[model samples]
Target: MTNYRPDWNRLRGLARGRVETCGGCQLNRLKEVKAFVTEDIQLYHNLVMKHLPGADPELVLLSRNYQELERIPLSQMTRDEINALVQELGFYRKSAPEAQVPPEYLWAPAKPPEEASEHDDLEHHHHHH
Candidate 1:
């Protein structure tokens, strides 16, 4: 980031409190810099899609997606909780060839035909660890 301590007040003012976000933007200098360093689009996409699935398309914009994964109180979740959140969002493991769903379709994901049990949830979270 331009400043490691990039004053969020300034950033918020720059973004008008909603212009920029955890994704990337001029005022999102911190997140932009982080993305630059990590090139974590796939990871970010995985994490975001893992959580915000089943939301309304138009309403499921990047900013909103970021809000869920990066800004929400759940940001402080345990790994298990985070994984549960992702599953709750419909990012469950796939079996067949993937659907040609739009990126935003994750926003409004379809429930898996079969509901996973507690054992299933555990298995999905950590390869049966």
Candidate 2:
């Protein structure tokens, strides 16, 4: 990522409306930087948890907690709501594995049989008669 140095000052104009040499370019910069940070954060989880064979369980839990916090609207949630959210996470921890089906194990219809030959149909009709 040494080559991934983004111009922080130039990007600052994204949130501020000043860098309008091309308004379209400013939006692109904002979107690209946001995506870069988001993907890098995901990389931290995959690299730290998956690649580090000796990574502590707590490190994985903390990474999950960080991800959970992203979905929560802390400022908007009441005390009861926050507690409910915690309860929901705990409920899924116990049940999600049982309830969720792995994609490869999911049910799908077998492919249709090959078109029947006229010879087989004639034999069946002759036997029935």
> Clashes in each model (backbone N, CA, C under 3 Å)?
4, 0
Per-residue alpha-carbon lDDT of model 2 for 7-104, expressed as tens digits? 33433312101001221222243443333223332322111212323321111122222331111222233334433433332211122223553333
Q: What value does the lDDT take at residue 42 in candidate 1?
A: 29
Query: How do the predictions measure up, each by TM-score?
Result: 0.24, 0.19
Using alpha carbons, what is the TM-score of model 1? 0.24
Cα displacement (angstroms), candidate 2, residue 90, comes to 0.7
